[PDB]
Amino acid sequence: ATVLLEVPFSARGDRIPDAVAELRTREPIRKVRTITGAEAWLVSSYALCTQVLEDRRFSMKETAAAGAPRLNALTVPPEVVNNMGNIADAGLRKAVMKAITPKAPGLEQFLRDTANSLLDNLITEGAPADLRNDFADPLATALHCKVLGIPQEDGPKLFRSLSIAFMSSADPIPAAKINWDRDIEYMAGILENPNITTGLMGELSRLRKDPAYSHVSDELFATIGVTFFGAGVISTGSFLTTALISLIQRPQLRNLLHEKPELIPAGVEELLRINLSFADGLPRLATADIQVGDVLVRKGELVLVLLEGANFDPEHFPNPGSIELDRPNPTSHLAFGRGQHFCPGSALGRRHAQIGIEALLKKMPGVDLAVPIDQLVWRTRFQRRIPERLPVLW
Numbered sequence: 001a002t003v004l005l006e007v008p009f010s011a012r013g014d015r016i017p018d019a020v021a022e023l024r025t026r027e028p029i030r031k032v033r034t035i036t037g038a039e040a041w042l043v044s045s046y047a048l049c050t051q052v053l054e055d056r057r058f059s060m061k062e063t064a065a066a067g068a069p070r071l072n073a074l075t076v077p078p079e080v081v082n083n084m085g086n087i088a089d090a091g092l093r094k095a096v097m098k099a100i101t102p103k104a105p106g107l108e109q110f111l112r113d114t115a116n117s118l119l120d121n122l123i124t125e126g127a128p129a130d131l132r133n134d135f136a137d138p139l140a141t142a143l144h145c146k147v148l149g150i151p152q153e154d155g156p157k158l159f160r161s162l163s164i165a166f167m168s169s170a171d172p173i174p175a176a177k178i179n180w181d182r183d184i185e186y187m188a189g190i191l192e193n194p195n196i197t198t199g200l201m202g203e204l205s206r207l208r209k210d211p212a213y214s215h216v217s218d219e220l221f222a223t224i225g226v227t228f229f230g231a232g233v234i235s236t237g238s239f240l241t242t243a244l245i246s247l248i249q250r251p252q253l254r255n256l257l258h259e260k261p262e263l264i265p266a267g268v269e270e271l272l273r274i275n276l277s278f279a280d281g282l283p284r285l286a287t288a289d290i291q292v293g294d295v296l297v298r299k300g301e302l303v304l305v306l307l308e309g310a311n312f313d314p315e316h317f318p319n320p321g322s323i324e325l326d327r328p329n330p331t332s333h334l335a336f337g338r339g340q341h342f343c344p345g346s347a348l349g350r351r352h353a354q355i356g357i358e359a360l361l362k363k364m365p366g367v368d369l370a371v372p373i374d375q376l377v378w379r380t381r382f383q384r385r386i387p388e389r390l391p392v393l394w
């Protein structure tokens, strides 16, 4: 007697388990047990992942309903599971999205300067260097302080909430509420601070005093700051970190992108496609009975969209494990999701990774792991796959 297949399969973010392909072939939607003990449907083919993400009857807000089968415990107030919907309902979607493009004057130059300064410090200190804690994460944190318009010196404290905020836990996490409430208070003070005039928080501070938004709650304005900092920093930092591993493990690609930096955008798009940063499938709750492949998903059931199931599906991406810069469908991956909840920071995430990689390859053309790959320590029970340290030499 075996137990019901448990998710997630592996916290390792440097390789996809052979099991994913077997599962996609045999049972591209199948029943699994989550860490809470709930049952869920795991969807692992490109076709079925797209179907679920493009059908709004598979709801992200309803995953927060009391009594629902859960992938993991909430780490935010339940209304925040509907964050983007709340933002849209408040009339703020266009302004938020405009503030988080990489297009603001000087933003890309600030990113490049920051990356180069972080790399110069590592070179001065001497190998080995930790590219996660001393490059990718500080680069993400600095970027998001700039995008939000908040002081750079406030970044590290906000960042240190994230090792708990993005936990994937069976039970509620007391520290998550402590940090959430403190970070909300911080963002509320930012909105009241007359010196905060730029970035997302500068724009929200103005809209807050505009008569067209006089009934939007102060809680929502502060929540936008906390959530966009947290989601953005964790997602860009974790993606860049594991992209660097995939690049370092491919010396020929490292050398090609160093020699021909104009290929870095195509390279980053493939690194996005093969990325294992999301540790769990994307959760949705069925709000009706819906046929998905051979399974009639019933109202109230949990569905998990396995991004690497879609992105490594050979029926859509032939030779899926190979980085190929000339694919005919290069952005059609699901690394940024799809449908109603498509990532609003996708352009910023691309530019963060492109600039970080460009700077690394210029400063450290000889970059290589300083430990055997199996020695990386993969964070467990977390919503991203992250090596705790990424030791390199050059």
Ligand code: HEM
Residues within 6 Å of the ligand: 060, 084, 100, 227, 228, 229, 231, 232, 233, 235, 236, 239, 277, 282, 283, 334, 335, 336, 337, 338, 340, 341, 342, 343, 344, 345, 346, 348, 349, 350
């Ligand atoms: C490479 C970096 C990034 C990756 C891989 C990524 C990935 C994703 C994915 C897969 C989703 C869909 C989640 C779902 O459907 O359940 C998503 C949504 C989201 N992302 Fe990103 N993201 C990145 C960068 C960012 C940045 C920079 C921000 C903000 C500054 C951000 C903010 C969000 C938000 C707020 C959502 C919710 C969107 C929605 O509900 O409508 N992300 N992201």
Ligand SMILES: COc1ccc(C[C@@H]2NC(=O)[C@H](Cc3ccc(O)cc3)NC2=O)cc1
Residues within 6 Å of the ligand: 060, 075, 076, 080, 081, 082, 083, 084, 165, 166, 226, 227, 228, 230, 231, 235
């Ligand atoms: C890209 O990752 C995600 C993750 C989750 C969601 C769904 C929904 N939307 C959000 O905006 C925030 C994100 C968030 C921010 C801070 C925090 O401490 C925890 C989570 N919470 C949500 O639950 C969307 C994207």
